[model samples]
Target chain A: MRSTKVIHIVGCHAEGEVGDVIVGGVAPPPGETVWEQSRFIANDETLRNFVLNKPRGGVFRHVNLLVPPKDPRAQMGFIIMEPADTPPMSGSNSICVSTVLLDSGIIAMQEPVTHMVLEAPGGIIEVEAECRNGKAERISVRNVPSFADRLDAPLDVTGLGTIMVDTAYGGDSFVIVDAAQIGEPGQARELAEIGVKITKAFRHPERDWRHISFCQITEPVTREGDVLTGVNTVPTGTGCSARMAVLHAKGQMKAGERFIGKSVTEFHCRLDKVLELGGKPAISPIISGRAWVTGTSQLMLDPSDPFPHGY
Target chain B: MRSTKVIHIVGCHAEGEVGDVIVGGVAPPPGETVWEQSRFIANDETLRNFVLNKPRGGVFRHVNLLVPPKDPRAQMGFIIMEPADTPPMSGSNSICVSTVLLDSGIIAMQEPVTHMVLEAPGGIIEVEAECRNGKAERISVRNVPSFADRLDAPLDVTGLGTIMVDTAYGGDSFVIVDAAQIGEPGQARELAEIGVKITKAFRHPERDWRHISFCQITEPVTREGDVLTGVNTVPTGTGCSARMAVLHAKGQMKAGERFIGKSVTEFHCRLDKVLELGGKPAISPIISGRAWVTGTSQLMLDPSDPFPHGY
Candidate 1:
């Protein structure tokens, strides 16, 4: 049966991060990619403008809906609400969602590696959680094919002047730059501005550059004990972007090259680039991270709460 | 005895205006005034931050909490939250709160006028709700004695230059300026900036003028029936500042002068000034407006939701 008569959300702080979620019963409307379906859902004013609003969620927060499968090959489906926009797939969210699914018994956990297929708007995402005592010790996600669209592309920016950028598709499109170019070490604010600027400069006029992240690559990795030295370059709390930068730096992402990465902190992941039928050089982005079911609660709308539809 | 174990919040949108409240078991944590208590609550960080932050609440929205009475003469206490700041008293919200109190069974409604004393930080507010069929048809609040602090005060603003302003305290402190000085058909944004600039030039250095508003007086009132001409001077949706402007324009406040005012729309109010011990002029402002219980909703936060303390 349903876990509760009301909506249950688990706060997942994957890898010591705050503001992320796992909720039951949310699916994508008709669309080919998760981006397409998410776009339709993100455009829904009531949910995005209200529920995703105060007393509920914030712009920096992320919420995942455990939806029914649209594809027969998948066990369950997931649609992400990232406060700002919804993409087809996300790496950390996959870790967060997989942890919740296994820990909550929504998806039964198996020994050593509990395998499950999660259908996203973009495609199927396979997950393997290392289980112990009915909990996922660590979760790893087999994300969608990520590939560098353009490497070492140079463009002059408006305020920051000329800079080099690497455009890639790792679940979402990203513009990778040098950490030094960001100047004075930028937080989310500066990175956000850079993302906007790069998108405006290089994006196709007619198409949307959804989930554009500005990744600032610091220096080439010099490893110590299998962990990269110059890893925590820009303090971005993301694993998919790490894989994107590493793969682009090496010019090749081979399977079984397991290593430790850092983004203000350390994380373990194994990555490999695969050639899809189109042979567009896709990376099988796998990021391993820990998450916990912090707690759960029910939401009730008194039917008279003025903004059931949002202001 | 208690309505429910849960917290019940009724979304009361007075008349068609969208600002509103939620209440049940909300009592003062200990402060002489609602304003003083509100300041501490506004500084509470998480409850107001996480809950009032957008996607949950926004900049323009108002959320009221019903507190316990510090003054025995008052029936109940009221404190308002504007997501941004907590003022001592608010007029439009008084209408919204009064309508909800009478309609929600919190306060019994009499045949024609259900009278109640609302304790606030600044002082006591007397409310008279015109009830019909267990609903408040119209709510008139006799707010704290509003007064003109200084009339025809001149201050040279950085961006807008020297402007003659009327400084007053009506629920909140405001600087009344001409609409011509406001420049163009301005909205809240322009007025907000003007308020900041005026405060910067004119405010006491030791005191925080954070809630200072720039009230733009548009034109002389030419009454037609019950409405005033060219009165949408400030774009504010309340009559509190209107009384401030009129009292300042007349240089003295007298009791029992009824007139219609406008701020994007027309409103009916009665004004009178009282001589304090210090002989500072004050107006017993009365404003009658319509409000409705637009809707209601229950907000559930999963105990697991780590953001319960807000980020």
Candidate 2:
């Protein structure tokens, strides 16, 4: 039988989420839980045989499943994969599986809200599972998608050639760029003196970033934790307005178009508002909601173990 | 004028092979090889206002930047992003930006093999800069997969239905799924309850996890760090073999396709000497190559005033 478990998911967006399965040698997940819900078991033939036999692999390393859904809309449908495969949608695992489906009832709450729909690999996302009346509260992860396709586009790379690239459309299709339009800003401290000269011209999914979605930029917004000893007081002086943040994923497009979205207060404004927006962009309409159903949280320990980092 | 510079090249991992840049901040650099050769800056208008635009925007925030390199075989290029865009093609930012470009000679050396070809928005990569002969030593990115067009798709999320998906490959497309077809796993708290029930259905890619990849079972080929004590070793073994790791971005597809295209070196029976395995191939090998850059002997401060988390 597979083994491993540890949970903690105590609210999230803690600098942009992390704490899924750690596997076998697993260790490094004890305290600290603004949010963490961790684990690491195995299925799908021990996760496709640990990514095909394991010999020091990489691709990010992920897998935290519980799947059993033959598709009936509801009974068992929890998953995670970097153990290669599965991408329909992921708002941090649907806010950590909407609190592991309201702590395993699969979703039945009603305190503030708890209606559910999550069935991702990306399609059924309809989670409204908020909880306060019973305990598991705070999670928001609606459909996912917001648009704009081609802020700029042009490609050709074999050893650094041609340029102009920017394409965004939520859920899938992203290539957006503007680290000050590549180069200058001191080039992020010589990241490989041009990380191999821009890897000789970017390419993934296929240049122009290969339309799938998830690619972000716009940093600048940081007032240093804001909350400012007093919390929530920015009526603004008219001399300010720095915010438009970006970063998201979830593919298979088609349907009013554009995807890769977020909410729950813009996922808490990309974790404390990216250094107060020095990296830049911040504007929220209560977390971009169409009807608001992106609530989920947990990892707070006990999903069964092993999920913290160094994984 | 934008405050925070040195020549950016900040975070990376796409076709640029491997990356990690830094120049000066909060004082103390000019030592990791002179702060890895300086030139650490940023832009997307200072990272999108300030590192991700407010609230807590981050992938591990640490902005200082100045990085520059609009192609010219790179003199500075790192800036980072790849869950979709910005800095794609990775080998950990080409071993952290070819050693910050030989510690900033902008790509100059007598024989250490100083090579360059920077330019990013995506595409054109090939680096081989070293420096023990010239004096810098480390950097090896050589992976790129010609932008898109490889399809054998299969997915149906909304509720985790169907399976199998592919996206133009060079490396990472793995998503193999099997864990004996998703079942049985028992101890370590049932592997953290099946790794947090499959991380709520997968979504690991907040950069640094950069391209997100993995397929594991057991780990630690080497990690005497705190313990695991592996001289002859014995512990956290979960039987005998179950390991798979893959995480590459800066080597984005086809330019040459070596990417995180192959893995498994300690020998568990060569998933065929592990190299360029392919999307549904799963069994290991396809962790790819050309990501061996090195460092970790000096320059260890100025993580940026350490305020809250630094930057």
Please report how far candidate 1 places residue A303 from its true position, in Å: 20
RMSD of 2: 29.2
Model 2 agreement with the true structure over B1-311: per-residue lDDT tens digits: 11112112223332233333443211111212211323131222333333333332345322223233334444444444332233333334444445444443334454746666643323345566555533444454444332112222344433334433222222222232334223322242233323332432432221121222322222223422321211211111111111222211212111122211112221111122223332322222221222322321111112243332223
lDDT of 1 at B161: 60
Q: Across residues A1-311, which tens digit of lDDT does each residue of candidate 2 receive?
A: 11122111122221134314211111112212101212222222433343323332233433334332324564334444434334334445455555544543334457777676655442345566556644455665553333333334554433244555444323333344444444333243233223323433332221122323233332222233322111111111000111121321112121222221222123331212112111222221112111111222211122133431213
**TM-score of model 2, chain A?**
0.30
Which predicted model would earn the best TM-score?
1
Reference-based TM-score of each model:
0.45, 0.22
TM-score of chain B of each: 0.81, 0.28
Worst ten-residue run, lDDT, model 1 chain B? B1-10
- Return the lDDT, model 1, position A156: 58
Reproduced native contacts, each prediction: 0.00, 0.00
DockQ, Cα level, model 2: 0.01
lDDT of 1 by residue, B1-311 (tens): 11111223567765455555555312234454555677677776544554466545555567777764657677767776765567667777877877766665456468877898887666788888887755678888887766665566665565446666666666666666655654544563355446545454433222243445545555555645433344545424344444544454574334655656564445567764443513554567777788877655434344355555434
